[PDB]
Every structure is written in structure tokens, then in C-alpha cells.
């Protein structure tokens, strides 16, 4: 089957976003148990930006790697032009929902940095910021997981509509 190309890309996009959420959580918790200077805060900022760049770069790589396997399948005669254009469009929809999740986690970490600066002070608000971020980051990740499963479900139905066309 050629929808394994889309399924693989769907799992990889969800893993990269899940790993990004986990990296941002541990960076916040490391900065919360720590006593921060201006230099430590800037090292944390560089590590947050690297996590975002890594996630975006790895999502981009997986989508382009998925498109190479699809083009491979067209030249191998294992898919026709209409099936390949449905596979490429499903990979484009995965790219967009995965990009939105990365943008939302970067915007989410920004709000977390504002709490580590302003409200921080007292172990109790420390722990509520930690669980606030943990909750909102997982919400972003599961919304991507569900949108990615929906994009494959959309591809499998457009595959059954192309077979239902016959040769008309």
C-alpha cells in the first residue's frame, strides 16, 4: 500500500511535536528548580530556540522524505497520477497542521518565560506554571495527533473515490 507513506509521515510529525513538547517541559522544570541569573536565562533561551528549529527542521525533513517515497512510487508504477496527487496533498495537510503545532508551542513557551520572570517566587506558583504548561503543551500535541489521523482518513477516502470513478 502507498498510504503507508502518509501514515509514516503522520507518525513522524506527531513524534517530533511530542518530543518538542517534552523538551520544552524539561527546560522549564530545569529553570524552575534552578536559581536564574541573566546568563542562565539566555542559555535557556538559546536551548528553547534550538528545540523549535530542530522540530521545524525535522518536520520539514520528514515531509520532503515522504514526498520522495511517493515520487518513487509513481515512477515504479505502484501509484498513478491521481493517486500521487492525493498522496502529495495529504502530505501538504500534514505539513500545515504540524507547522501550526510548532508555532503554538513556541508561543506557549513564550508565555511560560513571562511567568518564570514575573510571577516566579514561591514553590506553589512554580508548580502551577509547571502544570499549566504541561497541560497546554499536551493539548497542542493531541490536537496535532487527531488532525494527523484525520488527514490520513481523508486520504483513504479520496483513494476510494478514485477507484469508484472507474475509467469515466
Amino acid at each position: 500500500d502507498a498510504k503507508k507513506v502518509a501514515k509514516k509521515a503522520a507518525i513522524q510529525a506527531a513524534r517530533r511535536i511530542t518530543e518538542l513538547a517534552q523538551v520544552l517541559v524539561e527546560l522549564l522544570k530545569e529553570a524552575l528548580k534552578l536559581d536564574l541569573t541573566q546568563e542562565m536565562r539566555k542559555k535557556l533561551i538559546e536551548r528553547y530556540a534550538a528545540a523549535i528549529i530542530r522540530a521545524i527542521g525535522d518536520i520539514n525533513n520528514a515531509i520532503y522524505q515522504a514526498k520522495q517515497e511517493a515520487e518513487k512510487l509513481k515512477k515504479a508504477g505502484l501509484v498513478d497520477s491521481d493517486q500521487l496527487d492525493a498522496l502529495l496533498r495529504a502530505l501538504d495537510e500534514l505539513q500545515k497542521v504540524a507547522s501550526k503545532a510548532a508555532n503554538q508551542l513556541g508561543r506557549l513557551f513564550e508565555e511560560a518565560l513571562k511567568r518564570l520572570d514575573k510571577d516566579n517566587g514561591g514553590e506553589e506558583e512554580k508548580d502551577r506554571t509547571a502544570k499549566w504548561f504541561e497541560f497546554e503543551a499536551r493539548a497542542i500535541e493531541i490536537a496535532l495527533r487527531l488532525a494527523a489521523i484525520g488527514d490520513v482518513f481523508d486520504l483513504e477516502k479520496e483513494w476510494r473515490k478514485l477507484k469508484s470513478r472507474g475509467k469515466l
Partner: peptide, 23 residues
């Protein structure tokens, strides 16, 4: 600072073109 960000990006040992184009 962006060169330090690059080093953090690659600190997991993975190199691919998607990371390079994004940086």
C-alpha cells in the same frame, strides 16, 4: 548566539537537510 543555537540543534547527533535549511 545563533551559532550556539546551531550547536544545540545538532546536540542529538541527527543531521539532515531540513534542519540545515531551517537554520
Amino acid at each position: 548566539s545563533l551559532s550556539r543555537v546551531m550547536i544545540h540543534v545538532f546536540s542529538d547527533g541527527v543531521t539532515n537537510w531540513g534542519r540545515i535549511v531551517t537554520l
